[PDB]
Write a protein that binds this ligand. Structure first.
Ligand code: HEM
Lengths: 498, 498, 497, 498
């Protein structure tokens, strides 16, 4: 017998040893006599409409596909739990943190970003690391990435950015001109691009990478005080990356390497886990931070903002039905329980709207009714009703209007969001020149070593070489601004390729 | 205090007297601090995207509506059961009738035909009387009307007919020219038209009308022997209609009369019931039938095909949430368990396709998952998977292909459909010219007395008068063919109106 | 008979000599016979080979789309807008750029609660949405036949609507729901008073006024901004329907409004409205006795006189109601340079809702629908794909911005007007803002003895079916408006009970 | 400069060198002032709903995706024309064949089968070769493959088959057990499986493979005489295949190799073309045929049924916008003009419903309104109306019902389908046991040479080795029935891999 993943059916069959097989039926529960032949008028006669068994089955088959996630299409999933290991109640009143030892069920989905559903796992691309906490105060979705930062600092460019990362609207081909025209034109990307083209650009499976909330968030405590925070979840399996050669080879031998790896890890009991930490920055600290504490292209230096342990994330359960538990899963950053709130980070602010929006499309108006999306650890009650595919009792006959003198659900004052005062004009503040290099310099010079700097360049050049000369120069100019050697080294490599 | 219906909220409140109101939450189950004021910058400042509570509720509100039924849009719903009173196992083997005293849960929806959701109940129009039986062999939908016949005998004319019965494509107004041009051009309608324009055209509520399967179906017993049949469910509350005047008055005073009546009736304990009967024609009789036994414009004279008592239909339960239980309910005539099958009635044949098709549209691909539509008294097991809003376990990790050697669901021979021999050309056989007057003549002369015949002509005249003269002439020519008196009486009336 | 009734006859005549076109499937395949399906033998079963059938049936099975969540019942027409006065000092919007300038428009009138098959002549406010196809993109002025509204915060809308519609269980209209809500939210008094007055049931769409209702902002070439109110008065005059008549018409002709408008236009009696605006400077807004952005308040014409701008003329009926009316979509957010929103919470909420609901009711690419596309402007951006992409998807143009390949460029002059606000970012309760003053002035001055009487009996007529306690809560609110208002009402309730 | 494909944007640019860039607008046509920054209160404040520019663009981005084709998701498209070169009007009256020299615009889409959108092109899997002829009598969709046969012969087994070719429902991976269990259990597949694992299993791009309608169709002439036929379109570029190694390499170096190849060829004037042929069989021959002429697992021996030249298929136009022209395109086998009809081939009979059914799903009710699918060379006139995204004048105020006395479209008597006499029971006849080996043996023995047989076996064993031994045994037994050397060779190889 092979790996647990390939023995799926066998095991399933074996689990129903002394069991009689179920009667094959139509979607309406009507028993089927022969689902192996269609109804024709005579052996060599035409098909009949009366064959509803056929139609019923075919019609469903003709409808099993839904739109894939506009981004992070390709992915994997697992379930497990979150466990509180440390007291951070002085920062957040969130029930999910209330007591050390408290466990909250979680659902996770790892994923690449650019490729569609049939693309490979072992390719350079950041990785999605979404977490769904089913808490008593509703679901908390920490839709993070394997990176603490991102390519841009303003939501309105995301569509374009994604467009540049995807296929040429006409040829339907990946287009390095698109990729680098955008990147060279928008140097804020410089930070994430460096991360991207480094060794961590292609993690060895999902268990060997870190997770981050990336954006700065706000934590409010029982007394109502509030501080800003960052979420970090380090792999307990340790960071491990794939060499470009192996990544390339595997992308050929097993496009689903990531899915397979995870399933077998859990299937054999090697349950992966991550240690959950947070970074805290008081309003006063934020005021004097050397950068914009909400700029997604920046990080909070550990030296200045030490990691504060919070708990453990553990995945011990594989999905039973991928489509139902993984494909259909939906995470909304806007899903925050009392104690956790949003920060003025423009990128975040954007995602606040986008996620429920896209879900209403990809999945449907009542996507939250879907089992894996349902906040089963909370009592959903409100004045919302109906909608396509209303799968529950639709809250029965409870009064559907607020306020009302008939005892329908009431709002609880203690759940009010924290309020801060802001000043200045209401307009479009440009942020294209918000220091696009400083931290990148620190990364290149202080974080990486010679060996790694070499590879990073080789990686950037290997792809960049296919872009037009003028783009190459533009890109290189920005790289030179990060550090002279960074740009020069790349250029040299380009010279050879060209 | 008032009618049970009007006291709806009051009761709900009373039933929950001793308990505390639920906590108002968003869709993701997050508690809400204030759902009465949105978030703004300062008292008179703009709105924030951060106010997801707002967006969450609005977004759902924005999506409450689903496509109303393409026909029979306005209706009422209720629940109860069907009880077998007589043994007809010698004709059918369907579990629904397996033994006297057996009870099967039922769902029923009454409706008009042409009008849209906000139309009145008390208007001349046939009435929908659909029943859903939750059988062990899956669901059985007996989608019937309050008439044993219909206006046309070929499905391909249905869309047209319906169009002629709805609004003018440009003015969006009802159009007597459209209605009568079709009817006058298509005389098969004479029969039903006559029935529609009689006192039965406006039933006093849904409790005082009969129900019919209309089409000729086929029953199969345990020996494999089959026969054709008709279904009839006579009102035990007795036939009762509304006068033209009262209906007109009611349409204005209470457009929802039927809904109110039914709800209250049940709410007060006066559960309505119908005696279920069947007619039976052997294959031999089918050969000697003076007309086409599968012609939806023909009836089986009670004289030669006596009604056979089978059981009772009982509605003892009001819906709890209209949208979820009535609006979303779907009936498919194709849903027939072993022991009950379709006949070659072209109309029925067409219906075998239409319903599940249209349901996949207004409700959705997995419309059968919806609670009210689920065949909860049977275990649904097959090789159908995925699809939008797949609210279930999607049958987990079970093998998804048939055949398979891993224990998945199996076809059951006993459930094989009965088969009839057929020979001939595969083409479009015209039926426009089948008998369109004989049975109509019987109805006019015999089923109706002088008072009724008078009213019928007035009703027709009252409406036909607004059609152009040529149309009037054509239409009068048809009636005259049924009977000189019929044609003349109408013309006499038309002359006066003109 | 009337033009409407002759719709088909005229179509037939319009061709006259012409033979009929060939009947084809959706794929354009000619149909041999569309009156009989394919069976095996005269009395045999139906074949799947009959695709002509399936083709037609399948489409029929999908004819419907969700009716508008509200204002489902309506009527439409088209025409134009003509500038007659120069207000370029207040707005640089191209629609007003010059006296005599004509811009095509699209209008849809509607009721509110009732669904698609409900009657026209019922008490309810009336939607008066206008779509301007300008060179600077479409401008949707989504108005009502009233200057005010029942609430001042958006988060209460879904709730209000619910109360106005059917009970969730019985599916019936519930006066308890209606009044419990109103009685609990007295800010509704103003509009409620308007609703139960003679204007409650206009005599058709041609005899009522149109209002932008909300406070908006105009911006001129110099970058100077002012607040405004859009008003469009019927040139056919205000004409209402007595309850008795409305009732009868609701039975006799549930579509009286649709027929009336159609026949009017079909017979050359093109209806028109005179477009006006009220203006308030930023400083005036500082001293206004109430929140100038409160949707339950009006700007006294006495302190803010109407300034004529142009005319609104409807002279073209729809050719296909579905395609041209049912599918039409108005987005309050559709405002060209020169016209912007004000901080009116309600409006702010609508900015979001309409396009949102539209993607649901019509689809992602609902702007590609003929009646909905800005045909007077050239759409060029980085938006691509999505369901039913009916244009050319902007061909092979670079789909990312910025780009070095000549794709569309933003134009600075289009930047919105920037104001500087302050205060904490939170939910500021507004339930206690003045809820009576203007209402009292409506009852005392806008109305006369007869109107007040009717108003009271109309309210009583409906309010009497609600539970006594709600009746009490309601009357109390009315009494705060005016003692006689409350007293007259209660007296009537007393007889009813 | 590089390959035309990669110079996409630059050429687009240059073609507009002589004109100012268009004004960036909202979807509503409202000019945008700054689409690079969102509106916020202050430099570090939250996002406002007022920013409709952001929402507008974002909302659409959120809806870019639609469901990918349930099968043949990965594909490439091109446009060109069909030109008649010989006369077959004695066989068919179809307008597309009426005269030599007649050209007809065509749309074509190539594809794989099992893989999803982000999958590699150069893989072992059949190839879709669909053609759409925009004819005066409407569109004609000849939805063929690069093979004259298929794995199964009955429609109802299709979903299963596909399911077995795709991912495991739980693990979401490819499953050789699923793949081979089905095939081994259904020996009908032998023939097509043999083709699949032959050298033509991986053609060198789309230009070096053939195309066939596979199904037996029916042709009717101007005299009403009918015959049966097959459609073959041989590549004028010649058969050229890729070795496993290469396909493996390319699938990594360039997953879209197919797309690129096709694009560049057309872009550089090397327009690919195919010679269109037909085989004919008379009704009398249909009776003397050794097998069921309508059996999709059977071919018509060239010797007995010679190829008859008809015309040429030429492709000279690349898509301008892939999504709008390729992703959205739709082919319906049921789209057949007078002169061309369906045969009693079950598989075909099934496809007759599936295609337009699945299109109403992945595209929409009005999917025929999409330009590329619109039958622009014909005048669409009927009684159909409304429906989501009705992008037309909806046939204006024309009478929507048939028949009518108002001059609306009329049916054309000369468009009636040719009728055939049939006789038999309306039932499910089994076909699993028709001949599953003879024609397969011929291919192995007479068509293939030694080294070709060798490779064939190596490819089969190379995949099958990962299935459960018992599956291997059944499979081998099947291959042995075809020929001893076939099974023995494969077993020999299996023994080594194990
Ligand atoms: C009864 C068996 C079959 C069924 C039910 C079936 C069903 C389907 C479905 C549902 C699609 C996707 C349609 C879409 O999303 O546009 C499809 C596509 C396709 N099938 Fe079939 N198929 C069957 C047999 C075949 C056969 C035998 C052929 C070739 C002769 C064929 C060739 C293709 C091709 C070429 C496509 C892709 C069309 C495109 O490029 O858009 N199919 N099939």
């Amino acid at each position: 017998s092979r790996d647990p993943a390939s023995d799926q059916m066998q095991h399933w069959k074996e689990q129903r040893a002394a069991q009689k097989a179920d009667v094959l039926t139509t979607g309406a529960g009507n028993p089927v006599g022969d689902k192996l032949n269609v109804i024709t008028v005579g052996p060599r006669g035409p098909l009949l409409v009366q064959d509803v068994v056929f139609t019923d089955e075919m019609a469903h088959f003709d409808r099993e596909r839904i739109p894939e996630r506009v981004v992070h299409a390709k992915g994997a999933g697992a379930f497990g739990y979150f466990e509180v290991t440390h007291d951070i109640t002085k920062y957040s009143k969130a029930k999910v943190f209330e007591h050390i030892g408290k466990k909250t069920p979680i659902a996770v989905r790892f994923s690449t970003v650019a490729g569609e559903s049939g693309s490979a796992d072992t390719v350079r691309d950041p990785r999605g690391f979404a977490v769904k906490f089913y808490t008593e105060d509703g679901n908390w979705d920490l839709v993070g990435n394997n990176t603490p930062i991102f390519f841009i600092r303003d939501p309105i460019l995301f569509p374009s950015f994604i467009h540049s990362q995807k296929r040429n609207p006409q040829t339907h081909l990946k287009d390095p001109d698109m990729v680098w025209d955008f990147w060279s034109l928008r140097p804020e990307s410089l930070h994430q691009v460096s991360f991207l083209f480094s060794d961590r650009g292609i993690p060895d499976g999902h268990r060997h990478m870190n997770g981050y909330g990336s954006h700065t968030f706000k934590l409010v405590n029982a007394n109502g005080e509030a501080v800003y925070c960052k979420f970090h979840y380090k792999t307990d399996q340790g960071i491990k990356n794939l060499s470009v050669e192996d990544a390339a080879r595997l992308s050929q031998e097993d496009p689903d390497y990531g899915i397979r790896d995870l399933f077998n890890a859990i299937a054999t009991g090697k349950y992966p886990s991550w240690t959950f930490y947070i970074q805290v920055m008081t309003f006063n600290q934020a005021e004097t931070f050397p950068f914009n504490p909400f700029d997604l292209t920046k990080v909070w230096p550990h030296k200045d903002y030490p990691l504060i342990p919070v708990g453990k994330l553990v995945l011990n359960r594989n999905p039973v039905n991928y489509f139902a538990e993984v494909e259909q899963i939906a995470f909304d950053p806007s899903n925050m329980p009392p104690g956790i709130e949003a920060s003025p980070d423009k990128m975040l602010q954007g995602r606040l709207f986008a996620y429920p929006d896209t879900h209403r499309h990809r999945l449907g108006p009542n996507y939250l009714h879907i089992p894996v999306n349902c906040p089963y650890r909370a009592r959903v009650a409100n004045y919302q009703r109906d909608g396509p595919m209303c799968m529950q009792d639709n809250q029965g006959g409870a009064p559907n209007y607020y306020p009302n003198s008939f005892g329908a659900p009431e709002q609880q004052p203690s759940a009010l969001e924290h309020s801060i005062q802001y000043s200045g004009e209401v307009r479009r503040f440009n942020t294209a020149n918000d220091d696009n290099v400083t931290q990148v310099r620190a990364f290149y010079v202080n974080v990486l070593n010679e060996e790694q700097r070499k590879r990073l360049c080789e990686n950037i050049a290997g792809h960049l070489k296919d872009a037009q000369i003028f783009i190459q120069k533009k890109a290189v100019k920005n790289f030179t601004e990060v550090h002279p050697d960074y740009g020069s080294h790349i250029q040299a490599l380009l010279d050879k390729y060209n």
